[model samples]
Target chain A: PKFTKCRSPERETFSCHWTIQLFYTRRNEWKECPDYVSAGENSCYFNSSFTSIWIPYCIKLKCFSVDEIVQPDPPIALNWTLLNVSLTGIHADIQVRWEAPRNADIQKGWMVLEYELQYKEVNETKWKMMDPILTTSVPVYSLKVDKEYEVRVRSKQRNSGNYGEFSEVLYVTLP
Target chain B: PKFTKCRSPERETFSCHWTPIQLFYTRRNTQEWTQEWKECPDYVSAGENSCYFNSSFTSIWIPYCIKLTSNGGTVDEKCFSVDEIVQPDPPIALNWTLLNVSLTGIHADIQVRWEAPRNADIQKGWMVLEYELQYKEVNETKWKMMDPILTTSVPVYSLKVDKEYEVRVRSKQRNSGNYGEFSEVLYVTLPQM
Candidate 1:
């Protein structure tokens, strides 16, 4: 998803009768998005529910009474890690976790962040998926033994139009 | 996350999953058991949220624990071993066409076809499937394993002509090393050609 382009480099709250419009190529034109900026130069909350990790678009907060156009910096993903993976017996389990990234949000992702994991064996092709998960240290697993495995995780914050990048490959071996 | 299971198949990898709350995990290392509760790195795959431990990574069988803090501020740790955290799921659909290939020397040109498991969290990069084809004369004891195949169909010319045979196929995640139960045996006899 593309970030909402903006004017102010500094953090500021906006408040105005805002209309959040998403850029859906299928529909074309700014379909009325209820979750837009919550915005305008009027104490903005930037309702992120309308913003997504996948949808790409720049939000425009059209003022009803004043001439103004500005976008808040869209949220980005938090980086995570594959801490401890081990060869226990036969199952190859992975601990794909991440700490909260410093964002303008207040809750710190306790209720705002979710993650997904994609893993495959080191020499093999195709990366299996794990969709959005809610947790700090999200542990993903149940793989085959005797295979050298590699994993990468990505995260996103809910209510904020942000996407996380793959955290890179964590290598492990299974019995 | 109140830990529930950590299991290994008799001959497969060991893996598990739980409600993800702030948690930490540590294997039986030289560190003290009470080393002030800490945090650790950690996915869900195959339609469920989970964690996997590659058993091939280590040689010795040791113990481990996954710990987390309760809302009351008290920390809880769940312990495991070769037997403690024993953990743990699909279907096969099929369509086959019986045909004669050539006059040279060919058993039967049967195109093996199948759909996704009856149910799964199928998505790009995840839940994609692969198949294994094995067919043989119903009178034979062993299966001719034309292993590791996928797609809606696969061509097998190994069927014995004029012989009643059993053709069964199995499936698995295209990437991960696991297979769904095989398709119900595709019953077909090479046209008594």
Candidate 2:
């Protein structure tokens, strides 16, 4: 899981996503942010908490680009070993099934890893945004009986803001 | 985190906090559940098991030794690493000052200084805890740091020139790599001339 600012376009706050520890000294005592900052979700946020712009909090900021953030290694692949889309209804919940990583049970730990699901029309140019949902088995619901779709999945560990490559795109053509 | 007292005037007789108490440290020599333990952290209070007996136990970073034995029977003996269990108290005599002001009190240089944690386990060999420190702007989302820093008496220069930046610091055994939790957050305002 990764932390993101839902407040505005990050105009006032900064994220530890860019800076971890920028140091200072006694001769030039650096001030702490008064208005706001916090560790949350899987990351940290830096909000400038001032009522007036006259007294601004000056930070020699450290920032990074999307490419610079170190992403967690790709989750060991778990092929969707079972896919049963039987026609119980014209529109049905696509039961996407996958087995957990072999080490998952024996290696449960503090920094939990999670997987993300994504899909697109097989012929569409773009994929839908991925919600920060981490799960092993998922149900992509409500499909028309006569359409074709392509889906893929990705994974990330908690506190690690990076995401791994998407799994091979799986195509579903209603037969 | 507590240690033996700083009894000397210049704190010459001051001692270091060995381990917290009784919890055993795992040694990897033979690597066995029933293997030979290489070493254990010294107890702040040695064999004088009492409500509070000051000790001279030798040590390691595993943070352990005798549990307290007063107010009935002792049972706080839990295995923990320095960082895992240590939450050292904040320093004392905290204060700050302003310098080189522009006369209008609108802008000037700021300086802050504080004493070290005066626990029983304290400075000897002119050494005090090396520290891990960071500061945050109040309401800001995160804190930042340089690296590890150690200071005693008055710290040398090279500190930040600038938060509601609430400054905080945590420390540990300088040589053993045993770190504790951060001290209280010191909210600072720009000092007036």
Candidate 3:
């Protein structure tokens, strides 16, 4: 019973994913989850009423003491555009920009989020990861000329140390 | 942005989550009811994002409403009675030990014990807290919950033999119906038969 993921979109409630077992064990009639709901096929969610901050909630033999698992939703509106170094010269650098998740409580100072980005040539399978950064906008240089690139970004609560899923990929061709 | 929760652990006092500037109002219970609202008579800023009301401005069994406002406009207004908001803090120091039992097959009975929260005021008779216990075998996906009880210690039986388990407890003021959060989980494994 390995738990692959346990994430909280807001700090209030959380969703967990685990490997479904093949062999069934005997469960008592009274031993049932309180207000349990399926998150999908192999996942389930715990509501806010049953959750508390900084407590390790265990299920199916796995446990997570959180601050590390409070992953915010992925960055939104990921896009990239070219910035000309000089109006007179033929030089450009790619600039990537994104908005925070709509539900992120950044204004209330509840959770501060940092970002990380990755990109690769359109035909390539591997990606180039940028250093983790604090700002939502980044300037990327040294891309190959005349080549299309795919870029994406991911975000994490500054203190959690785990990033949410990656944002929608944005394709850009250098001019 | 607003008070997420407003609670009174005892009948004589109450507290709310977040911010400054509160308008306190009360309504008469009679058919010809009246409403009177004013600033918090005695407001104590309990650190940041918190406000407390002591006995000076708090009265038992009376309906009270609070409107909270900060730098921004009015954040929220909440109405409640001190009794309706009575929730005891979570039980503390949850400890468990194996019990010696006979006439059992692949089963274990463990005695679990806990104490009231530090600020419970139980000895002063300000509040009477009842507790509920929940436990589950670590390998299981669900938990077994017990009926609420007035005592602090109880024996949970019928647990799987020689297995690891997790247990926790929560409390509520008797007759209040508002329960607090669960205590931190306690891990224990029973000895083989």
Candidate 4:
């Protein structure tokens, strides 16, 4: 069975989608898109066909040509580093340092930096992102520090009025 | 249209059995095997639907449970560092100094260390092990250098074991260009044998 959670784009909505792939019958192969977010840029989780059958899978972020309204190459080297990481009371203060390859073409254009902070209990499967994408590199931000958490940064090089390759992925954690 | 990448275990053969709900679908969804390597653990990357899109996404390495016999839960949290620097070239060389040796052995170990370049940050990607080891042997190749190492302490390298060794080290940031010129080489000679 396929399942999904849908939220209005304007409002804060957290949705999930689950799909199963069948191979026995030729006509019946993969599950249809369940009711969740839009067709593209959606997030989901699925269960294995059999209770004990475990298959390895990764969720990929793909960009179709139609969505190429902004003709910028996806960030090539997305990355981040932790700097001055600390936790106090119910909030944690984290400072991350970041950089792009010196010779990378992406650095030639205008660059915009953003980051996401996600956290889940030690035994949980769901990860929640802190809202309001950070638009600048102020170096420090405050977030709930109840449970152990992980953080990552993303960047885009602006060229021809569009963003270009992203830096490599970088992240850090709190005690 | 959804795209799928199949990455099941590399056993002799594997099968994909669909349930009753998975019948009519025109698009293929994207699939990736969760990373199994201890160095770089794997996780899922959510995709976007036509109408809505995810503006940002992040990844982190953490302890996860994996069933061994396709049953029981296997939970273990391992300590791993995230890549912070994204440059291609290594960090610039700095503070190259020679350590005095007091031995009669033919081999001498040279140690050199430096600070990560100004443009590169340690928070993103880590400092990979590979590096450039340049030195002069019988004056044949002028200065001979070796390939890079994937693991090492920042800005540090152990030179050729034996022979009159004079060397320095530099770093390639996670995804940046080769850093600046070599540091001042520290020359050291093996004790008389």
Top model number, TM-score: 3
Worst 10 residues of 3 chain B by lDDT: B100-109
lDDT of 4 at A146: 52
- Measured against the true two-chain complex, the DockQ scores of the candidates, in the order shown, are 0.01, 0.01, 0.01, 0.01
Better of 2 and 3 by lDDT: 3
Model 1 spans with C-alpha error above 4 angstroms: A1-175, B1-91, B104-106, B123-125
Q: What value does the lDDT take at residue A161 in candidate 1? A: 34
Per-residue lDDT of candidate 1, residues A1-175 (tens digit): 3233332111222223322233222112654445344453322333434322233334353212101222223223433333223334445344454444444344432224555667788877798785454544544454555677776666554434345456656666653
- What lDDT is reached at residue B10 by model 2? 18
Among all windows of ten consecutive residues in candidate 3 chain A, which has the lowest summed lDDT? A22-31
DockQ of predicted model 2: 0.01
- TM-score for candidate 3: 0.46
lDDT rank, highest first? 3, 1, 2, 4
Docking class of 3: incorrect
Candidate 4 residue-wise lDDT, B15-51, digit = tens: 1111001111111112344443321112213112111
**Predicted complex 4: DockQ:** 0.01
Interface DockQ of candidate 3: 0.01
